[PDB]
């Protein structure tokens, strides 16, 4: 380091973050490696308490620092002069010493200086630009979602219609089979009386049935083609949302970072929220 001692005060410490809540700590530690840590004030707002959050096993473990007679420690006895000394001692020595089941060391600080990589009028205009882009992307996104939901409902309706068509065509095919089976012993009756007109009016009904079943098959085929096209559009809409999502998330993060940096700088929120 630089000061090689406790000269790096609590404000100077990269891992100390001051006043943050559970949610922001969980946001910063999400999907991080084992040993990622940051120190924040205790949520109950007493001076000098402090709480350490450590990543292990995919879970955020919460360790409370004690403070008695000017000493600090994870438990009794308290042997460290500050919290910088304790954090350094456990940055160089594993935490398994304090408790064997925490076989990990303090590896990766969450630096508060690492967020400064990316003139109040200038930053205000930049925040306005970022917010405008975020709003545009957001309205595009939820109109895409509405289109997608309606498309899904139409797809479900058309699939049910396909199944209904299948049942109807099966029923008509069994009706044709029954007609064919019944034609065996009764078709030879109108060949001795000399009335071919009876066979003609017999065949009229069979022809009508065949025409109707062919028409139903045609309707089923047309609706299946429409279903194929609509499913293709459904896939296209899903692709477009998948494209839209990550840029929107990153842009929202950038806007929030700018807003937090400008708010901590010391400006009253009346000038910020008026421009939305």
């Amino acid at each position: 380091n630089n000061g090689m001692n406790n000269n790096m005060s609590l404000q100077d410490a990269e891992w100390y973050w001051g006043d943050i809540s559970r949610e922001e700590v969980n946001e910063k530690l999400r999907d991080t490696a084992d040993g990622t840590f940051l120190v924040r004030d205790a949520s109950t707002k007493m001076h000098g308490d402090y709480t350490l959050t450590l990543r292990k096993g995919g879970n955020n473990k919460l360790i409370k620092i004690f403070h008695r007679d000017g000493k600090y420690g994870f438990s009794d006895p308290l042997t460290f002069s500050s919290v910088v000394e304790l954090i350094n001692h456990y940055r160089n020595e594993s935490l398994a010493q304090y408790n064997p089941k925490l076989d990990v060391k303090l590896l990766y600080p969450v630096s508060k200086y690492q967020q400064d990589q990316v003139n109040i009028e200038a930053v205000g205009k930049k925040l306005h630009e970022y917010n405008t882009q975020f709003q545009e992307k957001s309205r595009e996104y939820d109109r895409l979602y509405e289109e997608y939901t309606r498309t899904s409902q139409e797809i479900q309706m058309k699939r049910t219609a396909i199944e209904a068509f299948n049942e109807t065509i099966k029923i008509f095919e069994e009706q044709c089979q029954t007609q064919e089976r019944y034609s065996k012993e009764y078709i030879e009756k109108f060949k001795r009386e000399g009335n071919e007109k009876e066979i003609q009016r017999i065949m009229h009904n069979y022809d009508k049935l065949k025409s109707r079943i062919s028409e139903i098959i045609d309707s089923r085929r047309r609706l299946e083609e429409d279903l194929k096209k609509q499913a293709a559009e459904y896939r296209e809409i899903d692709k477009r949302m998948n494209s839209i999502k990550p840029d929107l998330i990153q842009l929202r993060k950038t806007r929030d970072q700018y807003l937090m940096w400008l708010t901590q700088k010391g400006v009253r929120q009346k000038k910020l929220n008026e421009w939305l």
Partner: protein
């Protein structure tokens, strides 16, 4: 309709059939014209055939009920086939009625090859047997007990603030005896104690009747006839059980409001004959190796490939599968990723390795996985966005470890979700096959692997201590205080590692503090076998806990079957019927957190819903309102099918309500889509044309109100039905009350039908408001809220109860003159309150206004509901004030537009302050204002003292789908609005500061 008909002999005949024609006529005229077509002699008799066709829902439903009409069949095409019956007629009639009630056919359950589904269908019938048999045990009394359950409260003890409302602990009642030679009705005013059971009330009423009716001089054994019951006038409420009269909800509400309790004396036999026998019968489908702890290998799962993913090759660089072994929402080990591959060829063929042994797997362990994309590029790389997700139970419903190949169809990512995995979401493959499918392989251990039985688990405990830094093992008093201090903490409080180790090291003394069990269960590492065995041994003998706290164990944080079984047993032995009714929404919602269809909670809920028709009505409607969502469609459909099978003739009433709601939905969908570019008057003419048809009239008249089944909706008053000009296209519907003496309760029942807006948020808000009011009234504060009825019946469609004699503040300020820059003198509300009640009732009007305003101020600030304006707050004539159109809660309009910390939704404007201060030009320096502030402070502290119940109730709706409730971070708003981390004094100071910062007034002591 040009219906083409199919006769069995191959005959095809076109028959012209009226739309309002019964199937008997269709059959008769079908065989009437079946003589002019070829092969008519071979035709059989007309009565030996039935009609079969295909419906719009894609099933071939045989028409065993010929009394139905042609249009009611929902034909896909206008055709009918004539066949012979092959099965039982009444079974298929009941199946069709169930299918209409449910919204999808029963047969598609039989078409399901999942053995768990069929096992559930076969096994839930035992619970159906017990419920139906218990309902018939003491007929006809038990049948009426089921149909008309008592509407009583949990405790007969009377709160002291309303015991003084009684005249020396006595109640005035008016009993209406309807002798009815033609229609004549009489009344008998009585003075009885509050604790008399209805038998004594009947005895005194008959004593009054047998004293001066048809005689004035003396002339079984004149007392205790026993042939009559008590009924609430104007509604279907009855007093059939031996309870104190004050314990019934209607009586105690009358005491609350100082109203006049009106009752009726029906005959016992009339009500007994008013209800029919329940002929419940089983359907057709009822006719029918090594331990996990001997496998020395780490768990591994192969990811084979994915059929397709929906990303663009010009935007997304690579994709990967991210997995993880979870116990509830807590990972049991670190997540494992696959290699990164191009989006065009999603093939991995990779054996993922996890840091957990096989025998250390908990019974409720789940594999959670998601297909994700990495954008990367430039200096700021690593931009990850999930595409699909899915979860698998590592054990099946028969306690068997999964093995072999498995194909999983994944689900779309929920809106507003950022985490790569979704462990809260439900398990199982997506029923839709046009979805990304992920192929997995599980290990094959040369046989079937089963989770060990409870006997060998209990053997493992009482041995683990022998083999083995204050854990793994006369208790000091400073420890005792620490256990209690942890116990009082809210369920979403910060728990440190030291606190968890302290809790586990003192688990054998935590039994004396039974309320600490959730913390102790969160303090055990669920990836350790012996720890779980010891926890099981502790839960086996745990002392019973209150339903308030046992309900907490049914959320997503406690997936273990033993813990949930303990919670369900606690609900069985302590939860009353009215408390079950108050909490039914959450208990229905937490059914989605169960891994298997057949669980103890579903059995308890179905048993309760089949012995109490009031519970069963809301059970049915809550299950039906979310049948559209495919994640729970199958489970809820199965449960609903079982309930409808065993419910009895409430199925007819439910069917009538379903037809009414379907007709309303169709009408609203027509007017909201085809009539967007139209004025309101032509829409209104169209709408009265739509109710002009006799079919819609018959569907929308004569059925029970879904908001309150005790209310009967008679004929529709078309002269008082209108389309509102408000947001969406709501419907104002007015029904007559068919009750003989509706004049005592209300002549007209009015309900708003809303189509387009979600109502789950409003339902939860009104439930919370009702609970807050109950807590305040029990504490000793008479803050009267108005939690009006609201029910969700489907996707963005529901019913809202209307409060009569209510106006919005905008309505009053518009009717009282002035406009715009004209400030209405800010006195229009006070002037209107003075006008609408004058004399000695004026002071009571301001008192009621002040108390209701305090209650709503505290409730709105705590819940963080959307901003209030002069159009979503209503005030009654008597002075009571209430809020409507809740919309959002926990902000959720902010937190995306900016920071906007801890906003005050309901800021007291000057117009309200002059009402509270009774016309004083300066309001903040009056005694009335400081009394109002004291009431607000006491209400805030009273709600703070019961924060655990509200936190638990919010935590059960996380998986419901409401955007406001997706994680515990959303409930952190409630946690911080009540200052739970602070102490009581700084919480009070924080509340006063919050009230000061939105008013700039005298909110500082």
């Amino acid at each position: 309709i040009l219906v083409e008909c199919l006769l069995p002999n191959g005959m095809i005949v076109t028959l012209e059939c009226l739309r309002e024609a019964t199937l008997i006529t269709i059959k008769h005229e079908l065989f009437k014209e079946a003589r002019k077509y070829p092969l008519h002699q071979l035709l059989q008799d007309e009565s030996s055939y039935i009609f079969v066709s295909v419906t719009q829902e894609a099933e071939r439903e045989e028409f065993f009920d010929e009394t139905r009409r042609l249009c009611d069949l929902r034909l896909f095409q206008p055709f009918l086939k004539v066949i012979e019956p092959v099965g039982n007629r009444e079974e298929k009639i009941l199946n069709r009625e169930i299918g209409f009630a449910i919204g999808m056919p029963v047969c598609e359950f039989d078409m399901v090859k999942d053995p768990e589904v069929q096992d559930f269908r076969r096994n839930i019938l035992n619970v159906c047997k017990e419920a139906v048999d218990l309902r018939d045990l003491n007929s006809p009394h038990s049948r009426a007990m089921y149909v008309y359950p008592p509407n009583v409260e949990s405790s007969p003890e009377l709160p002291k603030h309303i015991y003084n409302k009684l005249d020396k602990g006595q109640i005035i009642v008016v009993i209406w005896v309807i002798v009815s030679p033609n229609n004549d009705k009489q009344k008998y005013t009585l003075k009885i104690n509050h604790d008399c059971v209805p038998e004594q009330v009947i005895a005194e009423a008959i004593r009054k009747k047998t004293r001066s009716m048809l005689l004035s001089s003396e002339q079984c054994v004149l007392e205790y006839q026993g042939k009559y019951i008590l009924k609430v006038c104007g509604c279907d409420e009855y007093f059939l059980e031996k309870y104190p009269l004050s314990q019934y909800k209607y009586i105690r509400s009358c005491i609350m409001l100082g109203r006049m309790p009106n009752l009726m004396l029906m005959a016992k036999e009339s009500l007994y004959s008013q209800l029919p026998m329940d002929c419940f019968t089983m359907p057709s489908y009822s006719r029918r190796t090594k331990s996990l702890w001997v496998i020395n290998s780490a768990l591994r799962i192969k990811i084979l490939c994915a059929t397709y993913v929906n990303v663009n090759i010009r935007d997304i660089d690579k994709i990967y599968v991210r997995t993880g072994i979870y116990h509830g929402g807590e990972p049991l080990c670190d997540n494992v990723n696959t290699q990164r591959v191009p989006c065009s060829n999603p093939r991995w063929n990779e054996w993922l390795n996890y840091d957990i042994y096989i025998p250390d797997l908990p019974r409720a362990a789940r594999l959670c996985l998601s297909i994700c994309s990495v954008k990367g590029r430039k200096g700021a790389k690593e931009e990850h966005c999930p595409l699909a997700w899915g979860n698998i139970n590592l054990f099946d419903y028969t306690d068997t470890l999964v093995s072999g190949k498995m194909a999983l169809n994944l689900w779309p990512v929920p809106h507003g979700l950022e985490d790569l995995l979704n462990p809260i979401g439900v398990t199982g493959s997506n029923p839709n096959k046009e979805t990304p499918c992920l192929e997995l392989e599980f290990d094959w251990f040369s046989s079937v692997v089963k989770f060990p039985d409870m006997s060998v688990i209990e053997e493992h405990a009482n041995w683990s201590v022998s083999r083995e830094s204050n854990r793994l093992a006369e208790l000091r008093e400073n420890d005792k205080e620490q256990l209690k201090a942890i116990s009082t903490r809210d369920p979403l409080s910060e728990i440190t590692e030291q606190e968890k180790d302290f809790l586990w090291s003192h688990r054998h003394y935590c039994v004396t503090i039974p309320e600490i069990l959730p913390k102790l269960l969160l303090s055990v590492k669920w990836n350790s076998r012996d720890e779980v065995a010891q926890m099981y041994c502790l839960v086996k003998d745990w002392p019973p806990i209150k339903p308030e706290q046992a309900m907490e164990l049914l959320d997503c944080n406690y997936p273990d079957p033993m813990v949930r079984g303990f919670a369900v047993r606690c609900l069985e032995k302590y939860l009353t019927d009215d408390k079950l009714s108050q909490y039914l929404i959450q208990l229905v919602q937490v059914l989605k957190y169960e891994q298997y269809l057949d669980n103890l909670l579903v059995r308890f809920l179905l048993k309760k819903a089949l012995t109490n028709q009031r519970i069963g009505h809301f059970f049915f409607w809550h299950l039906k309102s979310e049948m559209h969502n495919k994640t729970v469609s199958q489970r809820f459909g199965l449960l609903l099918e079982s309930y409808c099978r065993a419910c009895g003739m409430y199925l007819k009433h439910l069917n009538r309500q379903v037809e009414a709601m379907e007709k309303l939905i169709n009408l609203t969908d027509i007017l909201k889509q085809e009539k967007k570019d139209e004025t309101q008057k032509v829409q209104m003419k169209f709408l009265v044309e739509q109710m002009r048809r006799p079919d819609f009239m018959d569907a929308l008249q004569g059925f029970l109100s879904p908001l309150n089944p005790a209310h009967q909706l008679g004929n529709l008053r078309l002269e008082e039905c209108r389309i509102m000009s408000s947001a969406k296209r709501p419907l104002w519907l007015n029904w007559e009350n068919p009750d003989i003496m509706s004049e005592l309760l209300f002549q007209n029942n009015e309900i708003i039908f809303k189509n387009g807006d979600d109502l789950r948020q409003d339902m939860l808000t009104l439930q919370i408001i009702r609970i807050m009011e109950n807590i305040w009234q029990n504490q000793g504060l008479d803050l009267r809220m108005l939690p009006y009825g609201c029910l969700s019946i489907g996707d963005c469609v529901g019913l809202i109860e209307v409060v009569r004699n209510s106006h919005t503040i905008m309505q009053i300020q518009c009717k009282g003159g002035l406009k715009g820059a004209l400030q209405f003198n800010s006195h229009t509300l006070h002037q209107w309150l003075k006008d609408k009640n004058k004399g000695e009732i004026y002071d009571a009007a301001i008192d009621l206004f002040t108390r209701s305003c305090a209650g709503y101020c505290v409730a709105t600030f705590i819940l963080g509901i959307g901003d209030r304006h002069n159009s979503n707050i209503m005030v009654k004539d008597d002075g009571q004030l209430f809020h409507i159109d809740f919309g959002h809660f926990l902000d959720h309009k902010k937190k995306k537009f900016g920071y906007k910390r801890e906003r005050v939704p309901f800021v007291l404007t000057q117009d309200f302050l002059i009402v509270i201060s009774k016309g004083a030009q300066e309001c903040t320096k009056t005694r009335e204002f400081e009394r109002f502030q004291e009431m607000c402070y006491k209400a805030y502290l009273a709600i703070r003292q019961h924060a655990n119940l509200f936190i638990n109730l919010f935590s059960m709706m996380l998986g419901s789908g409401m955007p406001e409730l997706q994680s515990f971070d959303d409930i952190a708003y409630i946690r911080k609005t009540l200052a739970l981390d602070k102490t009581e004094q700084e919480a009070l100071e924080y509340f006063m500061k919050q009230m000061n910062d939105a008013h700039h007034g005298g909110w500082t002591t």
